[PDB]
Design a protein around this ligand. Sequence first.
Ligand SMILES: [Cl-]
Ligand SMILES: [Cl-]
Ligand SMILES: [Cl-]
Ligand SMILES: [Cl-]
Ligand SMILES: [Cl-]
Ligand SMILES: [Cl-]
Ligand SMILES: [Cl-]
Ligand SMILES: [Cl-]
Ligand SMILES: [Cl-]
Ligand SMILES: [Cl-]
Ligand SMILES: [Cl-]
Ligand SMILES: [Cl-]
Ligand SMILES: [K+]
Ligand SMILES: [K+]
Ligand SMILES: [K+]
Ligand code: NA
Ligand code: NA
Ligand code: NA
Ligand code: NA
Ligand code: NA
Ligand code: NA
Ligand code: NA
Ligand code: NA
Ligand code: NA
Ligand code: NA
Ligand code: NA
Ligand code: NA
Lengths: 419, 419, 419
Amino acid sequence: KSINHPDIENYIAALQSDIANDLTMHYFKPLKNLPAIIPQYKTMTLNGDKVSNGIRNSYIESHIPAINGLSAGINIAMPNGESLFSIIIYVRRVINKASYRFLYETGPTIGINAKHEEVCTGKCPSPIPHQDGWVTFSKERSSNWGCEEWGCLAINDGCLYGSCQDIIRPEYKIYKKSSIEQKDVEVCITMAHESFCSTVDVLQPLISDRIQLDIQTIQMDSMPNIIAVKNGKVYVGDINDLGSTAKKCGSVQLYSEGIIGSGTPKFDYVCHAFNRKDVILRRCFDNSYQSCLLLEQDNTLTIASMEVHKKVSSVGTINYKIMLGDFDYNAYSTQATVTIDEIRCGGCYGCPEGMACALKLSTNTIGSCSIKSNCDTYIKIIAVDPMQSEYSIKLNCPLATETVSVSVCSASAYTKPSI
Amino acid sequence: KSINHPDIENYIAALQSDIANDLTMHYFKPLKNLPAIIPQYKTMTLNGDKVSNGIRNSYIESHIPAINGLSAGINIAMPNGESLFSIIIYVRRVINKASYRFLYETGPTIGINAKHEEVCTGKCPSPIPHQDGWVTFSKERSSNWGCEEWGCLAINDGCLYGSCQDIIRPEYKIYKKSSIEQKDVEVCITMAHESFCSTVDVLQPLISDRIQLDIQTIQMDSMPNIIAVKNGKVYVGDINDLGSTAKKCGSVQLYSEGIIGSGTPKFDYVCHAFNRKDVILRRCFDNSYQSCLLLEQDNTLTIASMEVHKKVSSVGTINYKIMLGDFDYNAYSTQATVTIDEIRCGGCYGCPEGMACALKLSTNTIGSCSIKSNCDTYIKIIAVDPMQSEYSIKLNCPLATETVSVSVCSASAYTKPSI
Amino acid sequence: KSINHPDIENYIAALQSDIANDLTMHYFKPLKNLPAIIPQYKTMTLNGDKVSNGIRNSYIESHIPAINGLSAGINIAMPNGESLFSIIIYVRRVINKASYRFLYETGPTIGINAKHEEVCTGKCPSPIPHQDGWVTFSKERSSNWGCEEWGCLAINDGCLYGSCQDIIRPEYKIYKKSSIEQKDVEVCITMAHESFCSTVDVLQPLISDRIQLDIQTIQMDSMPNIIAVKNGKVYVGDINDLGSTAKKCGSVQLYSEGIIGSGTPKFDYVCHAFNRKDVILRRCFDNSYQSCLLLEQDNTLTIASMEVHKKVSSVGTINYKIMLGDFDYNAYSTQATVTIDEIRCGGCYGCPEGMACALKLSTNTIGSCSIKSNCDTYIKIIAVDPMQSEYSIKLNCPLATETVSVSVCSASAYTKPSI
Ligand SMILES: [Cl-]
Ligand SMILES: [Cl-]
Ligand SMILES: [Cl-]
Ligand SMILES: [Cl-]
Ligand SMILES: [Cl-]
Ligand SMILES: [Cl-]
Ligand SMILES: [Cl-]
Ligand SMILES: [Cl-]
Ligand SMILES: [Cl-]
Ligand SMILES: [Cl-]
Ligand SMILES: [Cl-]
Ligand SMILES: [Cl-]
Ligand SMILES: [K+]
Ligand SMILES: [K+]
Ligand SMILES: [K+]
Ligand code: NA
Ligand code: NA
Ligand code: NA
Ligand code: NA
Ligand code: NA
Ligand code: NA
Ligand code: NA
Ligand code: NA
Ligand code: NA
Ligand code: NA
Ligand code: NA
Ligand code: NA
């Protein structure tokens, strides 16, 4: 009837338009057609106000963990009056990430490249001649009766020497962290069928007229210094840096300029009465590739591409304050509806991959859930997503385990492990 | 006289009963007969209210570090009126923990299991025969005049070969972390002779009608990946993972399926004119057990049982809000009364155990104290407990140290180190 | 005219005097003649009050990251009235630090100290005689025709043995962490030409009548366990602990009591018909010093002196509350004016030092800036200081890089790398 006295519909439309325009003018990005976002988180709130002339301007302040997928609800209502609409504070993305650089490939030794010579008289040359990266071997006093090349009559004299380098079958690629790690956090104001989002970092709070948000955090040091990569999966553990040949994964290293390895060749020889000796070479470098096979896959790490991303729980706290005018505000939340539609587990006890479980999950909302098991877990919370159905986790189950149980939010499921 | 006009006694009894019932109905656990809890912590508070009809409903909000043993006091008073009672927010437990799994035992080499054979003619067999886990050794051309088994006349021919594996005396057990680490935090509402407690984690704030609490935190990565255990004590440092034989602690590994070691045996032999050669074996594997002796004990780690617990300082912040009705609220605290009843220190400078001190402490309260020394310390704060009298700490004191001084809260003590 | 009705000048002087006296009486330290401090940080604020009789006493509460150099502004104004003065909350210092202790020196092998003997008859002695820390070598059956010392006629008998220890040229000094690490945080109340400062730690908030501050934090584990030091610079990576001789940096260790190394000497000998054999010794220990050359310098670490300091981003949150009486309060900030006056970069891609850049920066304020680059960086924020003009950073630039770009706060600069 009148713009003086608006009905509830146009009053709410006006308020949401005002918020949207404020956020957009302060560089929040509008996102549309997002999946369902039904807030799980509610904590205490602080409510306050100031009056200008005779008009009360009230606010609500609260905070939410900087946890991927988590959101909190605020209901907006007329003073001592009816509910109008909801504002959701939604932590749309939390990940840690760092750059990595390629160091070398490794794998088992499958052959030896070798060179050798012998001399009838004189002592072994100093040094033993060799290519860079090749290790040497030699024996003095190699000329003797019954053990002569053709035409040599020297006794307890001469030399047999050479050099060698392993040949490997490449199986793992090894990378080193080549940046500081950093948090990547995006937070959204979610209103009915529209969201307004922005990355947030610790030096620059998000400021609009009605809504302010900031992250409080602490520098993290969560990501591994060296990793090994096989078949798109990230392994961590006892891994040599480039140039180190300690007896652990990656003691033989194939990279752009050649191969690196060390060790004392297993070198001997067999005699002939009037022919060159045969070199018996049973090992060149030491190679501890079997250590690579025992590296543990870290399911929290994924290759983004080099760039690695780590799934993490909380990276801090998002504070927020909402001041719309003369309103009442209250927090709300709802437990998510999650079902574990299926669960398959296979693996073993004390093993590198432990007990690997594939879950199919249904959820009515983007959110974050507690994950529990009768086994030990390698995450405490898992982000759930209507647009993703398949989730995988790694478990550490005792040898005395006949059923694996897993719960996500309030959902439970069990399976007998697939051996 | 009247339930309309209650005296102070029954008014306070009613309010504390109302709180207790609220907390219990919202799944807080009632604890009784706890030791003295006299709060040490006070910071700024936020005070606020709303009136419904004509009744004011006021609150106080504040926060306290998630630190084991720490507590904060809130005094409840009539508006512009007398004090009624106190509510204490008490951080009853903070620890980090993770599961571990057994990898192997190690210790010094005390003998060699060995096998050997010789052949009169021919070259060394390929491969040298051996059991799994045994390393091999061989020498070609072992038959010669003056150096023959009975009936052999071969010259610069034949072979002497064998295999070996160390025997160790087990001294340390080595474990690997086999779960994510997690915080274990319990917080209590402490009123006169009754406490109401609950574990708290980051996804689920503690909600009752009158009192809300939450923890804000960040994922931690505080606990070691590999440890060595001797006599109930946890050591950390240069420790091989299972299957790695780098020259550091644990290069020889005794586990369920056998022993793991590597190296080039120190193998030679002595001749007889018409009898088998004697094998001289001065070393089989390399063994770097002396590195285990230099591992540092980490006094913050304890075996719970595998499960390890770590003592830590802050793991985050506990926020809390209290809204009882029409009251005034103010924070309070009191310095703890701590005495160092005795102190004994023994050790040395640059040593694995450093300077080890046993303290006997008295305290009038569960609490958390700053610990200081003229030496370097391995903790900055220590939890104090009326039910525990003995405390031990590790110090790093310079060679130029003749008296060790230590303070805990306001208490001081000194001793000459016991060498 | 009257002390009843003060002008604005003496009213502001009175209020600032009252604050200064309060802070000083509560053990804040007065600092004078500090560089310009113009606050960059503003987030949401909470405003509140209580009236006593008829006098309103109002407050403002907010928080600021515990970040070195950062500050936040609060403007103090008459109620519905004019601005009076400003209070700045200034995080004057944030660093992490720990003590370290000297382990050993290492560098390349440049010679071998050796001893040897031979015997005409008998087998090699058990053990081979040697000094502590020397490795042994021996060969049985060393006496033969054509290969005898003067007067020996033994055949396939006798022994040649000895011991050896590397000589190195010292290049790096290796230290181990010998304390817990700790935060060192100082915060100031900054008013016109005077600041009031105090260290703050998590157990003890800073309390005065008008202003309270606290730090909320979490235990950090940011600093390396072992480091290598060369020319005042700190290197981190694959570094042996004292007594460990794995094939990585520091496998040969010179310390107070001697040298530590391990390995199988490359030992052989040459014959004479009637003179002692010549010992050919081509290597004693294994030495993996070339690994030290590939260690990465960590520019966030500096030697304070042993004591090491680490530059870090946020270590937590500083909360603060200001209550002066009947005032209005509002937050404010200003973007810093920073210029990159020059930038020089030199280095290479995949290299230990990466791409090293020296910057000359101008700034109108102590502050904290975001640092960005087209290359990868090893810090995300950098503290800027009017009293410091030279800043250096390390970059990880791809082989496909022809111009290095760097921004600090809003300033940008680029250079072609100096190769
Ligand atoms: Cl050589
Ligand atoms: Cl940070
Ligand atoms: Cl190693
Ligand atoms: Cl997982
Ligand atoms: Cl073989
Ligand atoms: Cl002969
Ligand atoms: Cl967390
Ligand atoms: Cl090694
Ligand atoms: Cl300790
Ligand atoms: Cl020996
Ligand atoms: Cl802490
Ligand atoms: Cl840097
Ligand atoms: K002959
Ligand atoms: K003969
Ligand atoms: K002869
Ligand atoms: Na912008
Ligand atoms: Na709702
Ligand atoms: Na012959
Ligand atoms: Na010929
Ligand atoms: Na429950
Ligand atoms: Na009291
Ligand atoms: Na004979
Ligand atoms: Na016989
Ligand atoms: Na004092
Ligand atoms: Na101003
Ligand atoms: Na001769
Ligand atoms: Na002579």
